Amino acid sequence: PQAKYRHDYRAPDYQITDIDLTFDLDAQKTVVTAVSQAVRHGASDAPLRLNGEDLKLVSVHINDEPWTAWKEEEGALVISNLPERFTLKIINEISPAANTALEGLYQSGDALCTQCEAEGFRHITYYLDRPDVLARFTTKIIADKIKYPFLLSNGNRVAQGELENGRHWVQWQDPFPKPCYLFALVAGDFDVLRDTFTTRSGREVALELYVDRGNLDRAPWAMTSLKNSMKWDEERFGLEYDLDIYMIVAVDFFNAGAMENKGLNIFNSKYVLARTDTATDKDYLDIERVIGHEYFHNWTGNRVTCRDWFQLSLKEGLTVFRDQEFSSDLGSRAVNRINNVRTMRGLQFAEDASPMAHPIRPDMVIEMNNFYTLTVYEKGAEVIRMIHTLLGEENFQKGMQLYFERHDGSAATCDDFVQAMEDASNVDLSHFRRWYSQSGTPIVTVKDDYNPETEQYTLTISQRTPATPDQAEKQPLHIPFAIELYDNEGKVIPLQKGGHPVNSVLNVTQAEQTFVFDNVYFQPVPALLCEFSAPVKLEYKWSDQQLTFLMRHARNDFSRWDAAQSLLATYIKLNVARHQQGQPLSLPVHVADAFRAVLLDEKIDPALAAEILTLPSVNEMAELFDIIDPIAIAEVREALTRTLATELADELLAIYNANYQSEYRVEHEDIAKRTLRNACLRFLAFGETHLADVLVSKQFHEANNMTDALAALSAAVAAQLPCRDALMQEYDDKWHQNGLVMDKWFILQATSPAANVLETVRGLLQHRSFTMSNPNRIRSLIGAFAGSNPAAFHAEDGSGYLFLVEMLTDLNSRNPQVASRLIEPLIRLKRYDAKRQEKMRAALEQLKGLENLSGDLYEKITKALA
Ligand SMILES: NC(=[NH2+])NCCC[C@H](N)C(=O)O
Ligand code: NA
Ligand code: NA
Ligand code: NA
Ligand SMILES: [Zn+2]
């Protein structure tokens, strides 16, 4: 297919102000009548190009005049000779039952529902499918009352009727103009959880949460979470919900997570449903995160939307930032910060190195679901966070205020947002704008000198961004670089120069520069890049003792955890090299001693302890190497675990029992203590086998909740303890009728360290709870294998690659978006060694060859093969 470029953006030749939709719903054959009020801004010779895909056009009228001047060409309806103002009427047919791709209107079990972001509304009718066209929607739905008793669209019920033949209809009116990507329609039968929330200003909002019949007991957390989101957006941003009613529909068949359709959010049911014995702490906190996320979109995405899709980060960067702040306010900010950094370093960095590398504001896009990426979302959020870091909270809020004042009700650009922050704060961000247009992860090298004569510390900070596949030119960024200097007592040395204080966030704006600090009264141990103040790789020659010092003394828990990650980083790289030579793990006693200290520190926050005692993921570890040896990394992680499990056996067991809790609560102290207890159990699993098998079996069976049961189940798989198969069989026998609970089991299987792991995953394509028609199952099994089990995917015989190629051959026709998610491990071939590349290249060349290759895959494959 054909590529699209940000720099060609042009205001449209026509606009639409108002659209009245009617749907005659039926799964096999739905008929759509779309009456649109339109305007020509452009020139008379220039026709209206409307977008449409897989549409059966029944009729076209202009002001009730059957129109003759038009043609369907590929993917568009082109209409000529139009008035300056006219009523467009289209009628067309679509078939939700045939919609396996889950774009547009499709069927999720017995229900019908929509996904229109990014360019899905064109699968529903011929429209100006672009988010710079905003209009007021009115939506009429006609359906069989028995199959589809509930008929939902955005806004308010303004009309209702019954009909002959057991059909009924309902009409919705959304007062706020919107881009079609925000349109939603759900029809079906549901249990409905109903509550209300009153805004600070007195507006009473009806809350309706629609779940499949029988799931009303799993709904209350999500509700509480919505209410908390509404409260928090009020307290922190001063923003209030703007309609009378808030609907959420949880459906099972969904490609991504959730969607912010105005007043009618549609969620993957994985981020709604929870109960203490089906969902984990992580699940609860994810439900909290995503409910919040889609709610915060109501202002940052909906009241202010994107001028075009290249501006996607304008809303996702900002909205993610907002869900991070939400979770951090209500929970542990540090645990939150830590995990978000794990993700930046572990996954996003890898993408910014990949052939799919792109700035948070892309300049070129072929298929736009491919840019719903770790980069646009998470790095985009770090970019927001840097603006926040640079302006401080009060000015950051003044900028938010200016942004809405300026742009409420319209579509905007990333640049509009930066300008609003600049103008409201009077901090200059012209240079800082380069973060929007430059891909790749900058590397920051730091050098230091203490001079005792002058009591001066000197930092020489230099930066480079290496070239990426997408960009041959790179240039210095405006890098906000936070530091603290500690003296030998653990106290903080006040930063200064020439008598007057110095803000501890340095403006690193050049390829190379120097900072001097006066009155540094003792040779300092520095904390560098505090709080991960910019999304960069830091190069500084730490000593173990500097790092252990910081683990004991740094003010911010983040810097303690992070020091530990640097300490470990070194010994991971040592042992991968060793593993390649056939040598066992080697590890200095003082390294093990540092972690013993964390286990016995009575004062440390268990949440922090637990993160420090969590080894980097294999994905995090991979980022330490130019060439990746996935097997060595996997085996080294296993050995590092085994070793600490031996060295710290008694302390690990002590802390495990000490954190026992008879009561289960989703509450941040209880989650911390539990996260610690399970971190310990993990190590103990790799210790002496009989005690392991006993502790792990006991917790599986005695557990009063899914967090504890799964941690044990998961440890049995990881450590291949003798009780494993029994426990796995039992989870199957209990939970097999339950998709979302099974997803956890499929993930364990797909990630098992056993040697017959691929053979098992194939068998599981037949399992009773698996099916290729459900993205969630696909990702629990196939995805978790290919992306979260690198050792097996990258098995030397190329067997992992051929497996994924089979699956992708299916998925390319069935569901290109899911296929594109799954290909990603394969387009990383250049991080690996030559023999693996050659096989991976071949695998890609084969997929390139598929008859009817999707745009979604073509994009990644051609870049990967370039
Ligand atoms: N087809 C899709 N799932 N597109 C992406 C929708 C993601 C949604 N806007 C979110 O940020 O949560
Ligand atoms: Na408009
Ligand atoms: Na609110
Ligand atoms: Na907090
Ligand atoms: Zn979002």
Does some domain include residue 2? no
Of 156, 190, 224, the domain-final residue: 190
CB 249 within 8 A of CB 190: yes
39: CATH: 2.60.40.1730
Sign of the alpha-carbon torsion through 764, 766, 768, 772:
positive
Distance of CA 88 to the CA centre of its chain: 39
> How many CB atoms are closer than 10 A to CB 501?
9
**Closest ligand, as measured to the CA of 260:** 1
Structure tokens at 529: 């890049």
- Which among 224, 246, 275 is the end of a domain? 275
- The tokens for 436 are 């929007």
Same domain membership, residue 445 and residue 423: no
144 and 230, same structural domain?
A: no
With a Cβ cut-off of 6 Å, ligand 1 is lined by 115, 117, 255-260, 293-294, 316, 369, 372
- Asked if residue 4 belongs to a domain, the reply is no
User: Based on the domain organization, do 677 and 744 belong to the same domain?
Assistant: yes
Kindly write down the DSSP assignment for every residue of 194-224, as one continuous string: EEEEE-TTS-EEEEEEEE-TT-TTS-HHHHH
832 shares its domain with 846:
yes
Backbone angles phi, psi at 772, to 5 degrees: -70, -5
Tokens of 743: 């997803």
Report CA(295)–ligand 3 centroid distance (Å).
Answer: 8
Q: Are 734 and 769 members of one domain?
A: yes
Where residue 336 sits, what CATH number does that domain have?
1.10.390.10
Statement to judge: residues 90 and 204 lie in one domain: no
d(CA 230, CA 349): 33
Q: What is the 184 CA–ligand 1 centroid distance (Å)?
A: 13
- Annotated ligand binding at 407? The verdict is no
Tell me: do 228 and 285 sit in the same domain.
no
User: For the residues of 818-847, what is the DSSP string, one character each?
Assistant: HHHHHTGGGGGGGGS-HHHHHHHHHHHHHH
Dist CA 847 CA 857 (whole Å): 8
Structure tokens at 57: 């056009």
What pairs with residue 30 in β-bridges? 94
Give CA–CA dist 267/252, Å, rounded: 8
768 and 733 together in one domain: yes
Residue 6 belongs to some domain of the structure: no
The reply to whether 376 and 434 lie within a common domain is yes
Question: How many domains is the chain partitioned into structurally?
Answer: 5
Examine residue 409 and state whether it is found in any structural domain, yes or no: yes
| Residue bearing the CA closest to ligand 1, atom 9 | 259
Which ligand has an atom closest to residue 265 CA?
1
- Torsion sign across C-alpha atoms 616, 618, 621, 623: negative
Is the residue at 1 inside a domain?
Answer: no
How many Å lie between the centroid of ligand 3 and the Cα of residue 404?
Answer: 15
495 inside domain: yes
Protein residue whose Cα sits closest to atom 10 of ligand 1: 259
Distance between Cα 835 and ligand 5 center (Å) = 39
Which of the following is catalytic: 294, 325, 382, 422? 294
3-state secondary structure 19-74: EEEEEECCCCCEEEEEEEEEEECCCCCCCEEEECCCCEEEEEEECCEECCCEEEEC
Question: How far, in Å, are 138, 142, 144 from residue 160 at the CA level?
Answer: 13, 10, 14
Residue 206's domain is classified under what CATH number?
Answer: 3.30.2010.30
Q: Are residues 81 and 150 in the same domain?
A: yes
Helix (H, G, I), strand (E, B) or coil at 269: helix
Do 602 and 663 reside in the same domain of the chain?
yes
Buried-exposed string 3-19: b where 16+ CB fall within 10 A, e elsewhere: ebebeeeeeebbbbeeb
Which of 500, 514, 504, 501 has its CA nearest to residue 556?
504
Count the neighbouring beta carbons within 10 Å of the beta carbon of residue 771: 12
Judgement on whether residues 323 and 222 belong to the same structural domain of the protein? no
Q: How far is it, in rounded angstroms, from Cα 783 to Cα 780?
A: 6
In terms of residue numbers, what domain contains 520? 440-541
Is 759 annotated to bind a ligand? Reply is: no
Tokens in use for 852? 């009817």
Query: Is 259 within any annotated ligand binding site?
Result: yes
Under 8 Å between Cβ of 51 and 128: yes
Give the neighbor-by-neighbor strand order of the sheet with 30-40: 65-66, 56-62, 85-94, 30-40, 14-24, 135-144, 167-178, 156-163
Residue 254 three-state SS? coil
Whichever domain contains 468, its CATH number is: 2.60.40.1840
CB of 152 within 8 A of CB of 210? yes
Q: Is there a domain that residue 3 lies in?
A: no
Domain assignment of residue 240, yes or no: yes
Residue at which a domain ends, from 383, 405, 439: 439
Distance CA 185, CA 191 (A): 17
The answer to whether the beta carbons of residues 34 and 19 sit under 8 Å apart is yes
Nearest ligand to residue 261 Cα: 1
Q: Are 199 and 230 in contact (CB under 8 A)?
A: yes
Torsion-angle region of 367 (φ positive above 0: left; ψ -120 to 50: alpha; else: beta): beta
Give the mutation target among 259, 271, 779, 818 for probing the ligand 1 site: most ligand atoms within 8 A of CB: 259
260 a known binding residue?
yes
CA atoms within 13 A on the CB side of 174: 33
